[PDB]
């Protein structure tokens, strides 16, 4: 079964990842979604290991303007970034990517805190939220609002790495984690899991 | 020990991944580098599983002009892409990312074959090659030229996922694969491994 939204919010509030399913009519994919403000090096490593590794950062339009993150050019990718910080090295390590996420969420964030282009991909949520666009991007920002966090999330799609093949640089039968698998994945890692659909139902209780 | 360049070229010619080390003075990082033209779904899955998951595609300046891939904004990222193909779905799966790579390398590639923005990150190699810029981007394109392949490679940095933590969404002590580890990683997966430095020495035999 899927977890009830309130419980997903409490977990998100606690700085945990949550597994979020969009509509089968849509991608039919699940993403790991976490608040960016305090994402750790170790959690980032886990995210990278268990996802596509294309680590994105959903944020509001207000943050894209404050931080001077224009659209790269439908997923609203902004220009990519790295943390302008003395501890950053190449920008790709779990350390560096988590740092960038945290910095994007900082109340004191400024445009100069980010090197462009880089290795983290901010995504512009639509003003109307999940009831307006049923995407993981909106879901991330929606969870932030709901949990009282800074308006920046971190998301990544949970791929299915397929099976190991001893001594060969290939994986058999890879794909994307779907439905049932998603819930099982969540249970295995002690995470809450829910659907965007339920998230919307939750938000309509207050917004209609 | 590192493999001799000629042997690395033969492997690359065979459509295998090769492990390439840049300078310690530089990133001190190793990347998986493969020819894009025939990268398979299964190999892509392996690449994703064993790297940062930020799958890039080194290509020449001539290809950036032919394909209308302007700079996103130092790593020369162009605008990102997805394959405009009936089999593409969300653009992130190993299937979809490998397809995009293959399409970027097609002799019949045209700008309209790519949706922008997307999930694969082409990188513009500098005209002068590895002797001009000692980057993995140049190395990828340099291997393509050397092996007689289409002038598009696929690269990704080999991260160190750290250690599993049973039932917890974290990984302990993550980092990047370095030196020794790199060679061991290559042996484990039956891949050749070399340094950019040696690659340059190879190219100077002909170019001075």
Q: Which of B174, B176, B185, B191 is the best mutation test for A, with the most CBs of A within 10 A?
A: B174
For helices B5-13 and B196-207, the axis angle rounded to 10 degrees is 100
**Tokens at residue B70, please?**
């302007």
**B37 contacts B102 by C-beta, under 8 angstroms:** yes
Is A136 among the catalytic positions? yes
Residues of A in contact with B41 (CB under 8 A): 174
Q: Which domain holds residue A206?
A: 1-208
**Tokens at residue B173, please?**
């002590």
**Tokens at residue B98, please?**
């490998």
Of the candidates B55, B196, B62, B72, the residue with the CA atom closest to the CA atom of residue B132: B196
Task: Look at B90 and A176 and tell me if their CB atoms are within 8 Å.
Answer: yes
Q: Which long-range contacts (CB under 8 A, 24 or more apart) does A201-206 make?
A: A201/A5, A202/A5, A202/A6, A202/A146, A203/A129, A203/A130, A203/A131, A203/A142, A204/A131
Structure-determination technique: X-ray
- Tokens 């000629």 identify what position? B6
DSSP letter for B54, please: -
Sign of CA dihedral A200, A203, A204, A208: negative
CB-count burial class (<10 Å; 0-12, 13-18, 19+) for A205: exposed
Task: State the Cα–Cα distance between residues A177 and A199, nearest whole angstrom.
Answer: 20
Resolution in angstrom units: 1.5
Question: Could you give the 3-state DSSP secondary structure of residue B189?
Answer: coil
Distance of CA A159 to the CA centre of its chain: 14
For chain A, the residue count is 208
Give backbone dihedrals phi and psi of B195, rounded to 5 degrees, phi first.
-115, 150
In this structure, what CATH number is given to the domain that contains residue B123? Answer: 3.90.870.10
Report the domain count for chain A. Answer: 1
Strand residues in chain B grouped as ranges (E): 18-21, 30-35, 56-59, 81-83, 114-124, 153-157, 159-160, 175-176, 192-195
């Amino acid at each position: 079964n899927f977890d009830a939204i309130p419980d997903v919010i409490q977990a998100f509030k606690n700085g945990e990842f949550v597994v979020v399913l969009d509509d089968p009519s849509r991608e039919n994919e699940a993403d790991l979604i976490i608040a960016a403000e305090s994402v750790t090096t170790e959690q980032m490593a886990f995210m990278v290991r268990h996802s596509s590794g294309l680590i994105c950062a959903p944020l509001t339009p207000e943050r894209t303007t404050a931080l001077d993150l224009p659209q790269m050019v439908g997923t609203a990718y902004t220009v990519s970034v790295d943390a302008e910080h003395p501890s950053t090295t190449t920008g790709i390590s779990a350390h560096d990517r988590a740092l960038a996420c945290r910095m994007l969420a900082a109340p004191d964030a400024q445009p100069s805190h980010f090197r462009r282009p880089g290795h983290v991909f901010p995504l512009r949520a639509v003003a109307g939220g999940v009831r307006a666009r049923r995407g993981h991007t909106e879901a991330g920002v929606e969870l932030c609002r709901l949990a009282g966090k800074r308006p920046v999330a971190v998301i990544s799609e949970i791929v299915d790495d397929g099976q190991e093949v001893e001594g060969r640089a290939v994986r058999a039968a890879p794909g994307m984690l779907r439905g049932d698998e998603c819930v099982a994945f969540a249970r295995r890692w002690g995470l809450k899991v829910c659907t965007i659909e339920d998230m919307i139902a939750h938000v309509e209780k207050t917004e209609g």
